Amino acid sequence: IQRTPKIQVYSRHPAENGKSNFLNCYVSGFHPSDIEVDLLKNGERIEKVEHSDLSFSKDWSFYLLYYTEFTPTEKDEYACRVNHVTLSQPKIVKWDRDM
């Protein structure tokens, strides 16, 4: 079976320019487990991004948290890019400070 990933991009703490925080990209509800996730800063892949250990839900669908420390500013744009067998092209979800 194939289930496409749900994707949420958000910060650990409420964002405030100049204050170190963590940028999170949470992917869930997908199957199979191979998935590619990148955190982008102004369109460019951020380097030191880590991820949680592969785990899954009651419905057997997988979930992972990709994250990296960061300091938002009013202008710097952040996003999460995901590719999965179920996606015909990478899906990019921008980081909305109010979601």
């Binding site: 194939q2 949420q8 869930s28 487990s33 785990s55 899954f56 057997w60």
Partner: protein, 274 residues
Amino acid sequence: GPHSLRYFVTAVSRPGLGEPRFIAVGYVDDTQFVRFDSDADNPRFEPRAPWMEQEGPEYWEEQTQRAKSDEQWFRVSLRTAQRYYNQSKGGSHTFQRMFGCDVGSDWRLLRGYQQFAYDGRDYIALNEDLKTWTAADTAALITRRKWEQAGDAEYYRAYLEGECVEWLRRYLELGNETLLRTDSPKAHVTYHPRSQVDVTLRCWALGFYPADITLTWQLNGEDLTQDMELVETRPAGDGTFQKWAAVVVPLGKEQNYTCHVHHKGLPEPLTLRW
């Protein structure tokens, strides 16, 4: 209060690219505490919560060996399933297993689990009686017959009612001051004009643990579950979680709506509004 001990195990074949990847993670409630990953430099069970650093070499060696034995079981099971389903070789497949125990107030077994999925669909599951099996399709009835003739279920029942609950109790002892704590949610309502006709009301719940929470919007004392957009609960990364629930209502009517929050850290539910 109830607690659970759960392991989530995943094996994924990669034809032509090596042996299947095999990963196991264990949880106590919503806190991950161990992991085994076949692709680590030196594959072994390792602590993933600080309070596990208290277990010695003998605990880790035995756990690691159980993982490695289970790893070979999965290599065999991926090949067997492919035969039962008469699938072409060369395909990449997934076998998953979840097992563990939920305990009640007396911290005694309440529900034992040991079940499996193949390519993300139910395959076979130990029933709540810890004696019989529910096979999901014909291939699984083949597996069910083998297990029903062994006396396979009795073995899991003894582990679920014994070792599983005894180790869960031990883990709760080891990480007591963090595992039994709650962090009640910090909640608030935000407002977002959508048109010049309607507005989005979003009820936020942040920094809570455990993860179970109920967020509901109400109007005149009735639930608006039918109009609610509810995102799945998500990890903040620090052991706590976040969630939000939104409703689109008429401009100037936003004061009619109240968000309701229930959580283990809230003796009385919250009632808030814009």
